[PDB]
Scaffold this motif. Sequence first.
Motif, mmCIF file in Angstrom:
data_model
loop_
_atom_site.group_PDB
_atom_site.id
_atom_site.type_symbol
_atom_site.label_atom_id
_atom_site.label_comp_id
_atom_site.label_asym_id
_atom_site.label_seq_id
_atom_site.Cartn_x
_atom_site.Cartn_y
_atom_site.Cartn_z
ATOM 1 N N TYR A 141 0.401 4.463 -1.341
ATOM 2 C CA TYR A 141 -0.148 5.809 -0.582
ATOM 3 C C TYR A 141 -1.254 5.363 1.184
ATOM 4 O O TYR A 141 -2.326 4.879 0.966
ATOM 5 C CB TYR A 141 -1.171 5.949 -1.111
ATOM 6 N N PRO A 142 -1.004 6.575 1.657
ATOM 7 C CA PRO A 142 -1.477 6.476 3.241
ATOM 8 C C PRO A 142 -2.508 6.927 3.591
ATOM 9 O O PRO A 142 -3.094 8.259 3.289
ATOM 10 C CB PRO A 142 -0.035 7.057 4.207
ATOM 11 N N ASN A 143 -3.959 6.396 2.913
ATOM 12 C CA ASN A 143 -4.920 7.208 3.290
ATOM 13 C C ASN A 143 -5.788 6.293 4.959
ATOM 14 O O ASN A 143 -6.652 6.010 5.597
ATOM 15 C CB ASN A 143 -5.735 5.941 2.559
ATOM 16 N N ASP A 159 1.281 -1.286 -0.451
ATOM 17 C CA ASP A 159 0.357 -0.062 -0.396
ATOM 18 C C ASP A 159 1.111 1.132 0.154
ATOM 19 O O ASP A 159 1.152 2.018 1.015
ATOM 20 C CB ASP A 159 -1.123 -0.464 1.428
ATOM 21 N N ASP A 217 -5.837 3.096 7.316
ATOM 22 C CA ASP A 217 -4.016 3.381 6.787
ATOM 23 C C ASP A 217 -2.854 4.123 8.417
ATOM 24 O O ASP A 217 -3.581 5.428 8.941
ATOM 25 C CB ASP A 217 -3.754 4.061 5.205
HETATM 26 CA CA LIG Z 1 -3.975 3.816 0.810
#
Ligand SMILES: [Ca+2]
Lengths: 237, 226, 237, 226
Positions: free
Chosen positions: A12-14, A10, A19
């Motif tokens: 991209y930190p959402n 993963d 996340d």
């Molecule tokens: Ca993400």
Amino acid sequence: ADTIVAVELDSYPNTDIGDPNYPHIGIDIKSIRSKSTARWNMQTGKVGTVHISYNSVAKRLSAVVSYSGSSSTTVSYDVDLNNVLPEWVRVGLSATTGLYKETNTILSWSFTSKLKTNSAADENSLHFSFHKFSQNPKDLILQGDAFTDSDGNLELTKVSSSGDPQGNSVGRALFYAPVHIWEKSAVVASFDATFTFLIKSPDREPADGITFFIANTDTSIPSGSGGRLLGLFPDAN
Amino acid sequence: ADTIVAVELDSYPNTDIGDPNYPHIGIDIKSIRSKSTARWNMQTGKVGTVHISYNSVAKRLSAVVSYSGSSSTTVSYDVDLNNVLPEWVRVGLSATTGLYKETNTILSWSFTSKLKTENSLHFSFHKFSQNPKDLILQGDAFTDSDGNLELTKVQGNSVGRALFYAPVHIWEKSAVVASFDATFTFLIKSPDREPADGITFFIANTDTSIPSGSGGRLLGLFPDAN
Amino acid sequence: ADTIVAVELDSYPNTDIGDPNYPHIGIDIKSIRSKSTARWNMQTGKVGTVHISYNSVAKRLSAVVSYSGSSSTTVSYDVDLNNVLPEWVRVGLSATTGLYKETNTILSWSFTSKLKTNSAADENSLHFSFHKFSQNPKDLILQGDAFTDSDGNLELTKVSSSGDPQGNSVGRALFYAPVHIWEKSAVVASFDATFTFLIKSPDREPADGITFFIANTDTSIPSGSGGRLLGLFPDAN
Amino acid sequence: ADTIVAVELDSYPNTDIGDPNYPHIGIDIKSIRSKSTARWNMQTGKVGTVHISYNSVAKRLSAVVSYSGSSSTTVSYDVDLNNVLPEWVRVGLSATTGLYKETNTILSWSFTSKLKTENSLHFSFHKFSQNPKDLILQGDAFTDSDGNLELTKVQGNSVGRALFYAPVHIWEKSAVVASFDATFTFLIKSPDREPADGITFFIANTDTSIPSGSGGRLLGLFPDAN
Ligand SMILES: [Ca+2]
Ligand SMILES: [Ca+2]
Ligand SMILES: [Mn+2]
Ligand SMILES: [Mn+2]
């Protein structure tokens, strides 16, 4: 389609859907909200290697990523996968891009699965291995934007002729044959998977990642599963 | 028409002059008339084992049949399969019954395929599920209560086949070596000693199906006897 | 030691002992005088790949060599190996240099062997796979000049610190465990082998080559087997 | 001393307070006092199956025992084996008899090891040769006329082991994942129903041998009960 176990890489930190505040690897059990995560020291422009294991006796789902001459990161989760998954599944690779992007390119994929019972006269075994891919890979179910390019690499997400990644693609490749992973009188089930991937990005902080996933055989890109949901879940529960 | 490469076990009368006077094991390339055969000491009610192998450097396709505590029979045919078969295939088994009380029960089936320049496939089954989702069952083929794969009906003239579900990549331009190996075990159950029967492992085009007419001695594989 | 089957990759044409007038691949059955040969389009300074097959039903010993993005050469020979070899063997790699030289460097080695009978309850199977090599490979019998270098490549013949090959070396590496390849009531025996090699040479016309060989378990570099005899035979009969 | 990692099947009384009161399957790390055990429903004269696996990312070592038409017992212990075992090992089986009439007959044994950064090993035996040259037989161990591997004498207090001949590379600095899996089938024949017996799969240093005093409940593996 509705049932999903996945190892997610993963980029991209959402934050607001759970996340961690960095690139991570995680184990996803029926939700995009990883049951377990570990920091992922991403290295854009390099070939990475993922190994994934499970044994129904141990009841531990494990995964590792490393790059060539670099350190590795590992994540684990205690889970009896037969209380989660059907006895017959398809295995696949998934990737997405959003507004931020990346190549989600796969160089090789291998998978081994075994199912043992009482008598050695009652069992199954399955193995496949791909180093590069046919231009019409007839043993793969290509879903969404998934395509194999002129170099024979599997591109899960849209890449221009230029060689450059597009935003808002989903792709998935599933192996043709279903996999028999549990049965009433099974003593031991196990699987192993490996894949190699190349993520390139102009972007600061690329998006969105790649998974290896296991699903009901009839699985499909659910509508509304783009971006941070990685082609796997219809919502973010 | 389908493109067929088969290894068959055949106890039918072959009334055509070239062909043999006893149950035989034979190698079929695109026709029911085996390019090569050998004696098969066909033992009803005992479990038999078939191993088949090919290597695209050796260009020799070969097969063995044996029974436990018994001796074996082998057959080979020099052939280049990348000029016979499409690049992508499906593998399977087939059986047909004569006018006898007899079963064609598969207890186990394994297969391995390698394509080098880049591709490997392997399956192995010991007994079968009630719903073998990774098999394509054709004709009278079904898995029974014991987990055994019955290729034909449990009177005669049944035809049944079972294909493995994924296509197999067996050749390509860039290819240096393609190889495959397959094994199966089988049981013909019958009150008769030399019933008329046929059972095959075969390779074919991916969209293959049973040709009408193909019963008995055409093994569920071919429309003509040509 | 006395009994030898081998696939030889023969860089230096030694005419008077049967070699064709060029680099070749050959199948050697109890003699250095190949039972069958094919032109070998050697490519010095490139990684080459050898695949070797046998099946006791077919009775055909086969081999192929290719380089990366180049053409390939194949040789074959009809031989029942159980009239030649003992039931237990050791498998190995050999190389020599003479006055003319070359690196005989091995990057990987894999071997698979199977033995089947009547009942599936009576059989054996063996597989090994090396990509690069330990500095003390404890599952290899290193014989003569064979050594694994600081890069983890297996050097069958002498190479200087410089990186440059010495003349008059023999080397051999054998796998530790003996291999059971036939037995009274065997129905099918088969083996497969792959290795990768790098041959570098200053020389016009390098020497002498590399083999994969199968021998009696107690095998050893026979005295006087240097140079053109590739580490295998004590004379040239 | 030797360095031992074992999975054992034990029907000896274990009179030390910590330990159990019935036949058990257990995981041994460097001592006879199992870091983790579970009930073993020990069925004399029926063929049993053991599967063992480990993965160095999961750091969970686990084992199962079952008999046909029977149910199974499992055991696990979280452990990192690159801190317990040397880098190179030898794998084997061991057995010991008490004071009973009983056999420890191995019908089959397989093993796979993988070391990734680069290394694979696999062997598989169904029955054994009269002269098993790829096995190192220790103590009372011999292969019998039926091709079965008898670890103990066919009265009691025998000790016998069988190692696989090549050393196994199970760890290295550069290592990312090491994994192994092993299977064996066994038959304890005995006129008694719950005899005192012990049978193990084990991993040890490559120069391992039988320690004196290791009879009975020390399984042929350990000199002390510490
Ligand atoms: Ca993400
Ligand atoms: Ca020469
Ligand atoms: Mn995430
Ligand atoms: Mn020569």
